[model samples]
Target: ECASNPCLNQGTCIDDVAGYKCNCLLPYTGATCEVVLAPCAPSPCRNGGECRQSEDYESFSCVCPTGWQGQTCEVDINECVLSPCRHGASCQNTHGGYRCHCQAGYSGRNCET
Candidate 1:
């Protein structure tokens, strides 16, 4: 008599002659239970990163994009944070709420380099 419930996380539990089996539902996986499969578990990034699922939990993709860095795109190699540029540098807003400039050799949120 198997007391263990083969079903979890809204999965259907079926009792088999050998033991208990779980029929996982959509958005869930694994045996004896249905855990919200973290689609980002694998390194889906082709360059050097991981895959991150969207808020809707429908799909995922490489965590980082081209010409970018960081574990979760938390940082940027270039750009500025504050609204500052060089004497002739042009302030340009980049990704992750950052800014950059052509005339300035800076890189940060405020173009501080």
Candidate 2:
């Protein structure tokens, strides 16, 4: 009687009164587990970026946070990209700004002198 096993996406199908119930996986829905739910329903984009759902409902796009980049705002804008770190120092990107990793003979915000 339960031979059809009409569940999709490896979902579990259970016999019910005159029909069947499907236990769908994460990001899936609808009867027989045929529908894919939108990923933006939970909104993965952080730091005030707008979450745009993908056409396939499996991914999302970020509309950019203030002074931020990347699909999930993971990369903070590097303010020190313009030679801010002097004396051969290294620049590290931080929230809303940049940090200078000073060299052995340099110090300060820009690693000057």
Candidate 3:
């Protein structure tokens, strides 16, 4: 009489007219809901972002590197947007970092020198 609880991963087993059904929780699937789905199967993060699964296995988090933002690290933080580079220098965004392309006679991290 379905007393053995064939469901897995804390799935709810309901006895129906034909047999039984398993209402699986998040990140679980299959007939008896015995599959533990990979939270990062498709890898939501991008641009070298680290993928970390949620404790409840329902979602994931992207740990973006420096100079990157957005949910998938798709945004490139433009340091030059604020004119950080002085002396007519230009700013170039690098992976997890930034670089200042200085004009002639200009030097320094932000070309402030």
Q: Estimate each model's TM-score.
A: 0.37, 0.44, 0.60
Deviation from native of the Cα of residue 62 in model 2, angstroms: 0.9
Least well predicted 10-residue stretch by lDDT in candidate 2: 74-83
Candidate 2 structure quality by residue, lDDT tens digits, 62-90 = 89866688888767887766757888888
Q: In model 1, where do residues sit more than 4 Å from their true spots?
A: 1-6, 41-51, 54-60, 63-113
Per-residue lDDT of model 1, residues 9-89, tens digit only: 777777779977778776677775656867676655555556778775667766676546665555555544444565555
Misplaced by over 4 Å in model 2 are 1-29, 32-36, 83-94, 98-113
User: What lDDT would each prediction earn against the true structure?
Assistant: 0.61, 0.80, 0.83
Best by lDDT: 3
Task: Point to the candidate with the largest TM-score.
Answer: 3
C-alpha RMSD of each candidate structure in angstroms? 7.9, 8.8, 3.8
Off by over 4 Å in 3: 52-61, 86-90, 93-97, 101-108, 111-113
Give the CA lDDT, 0 to 100, for residue 51 in model 3. Answer: 90
Angstrom error at residue 112, model 3: 6.8
lDDT of 1: 0.61
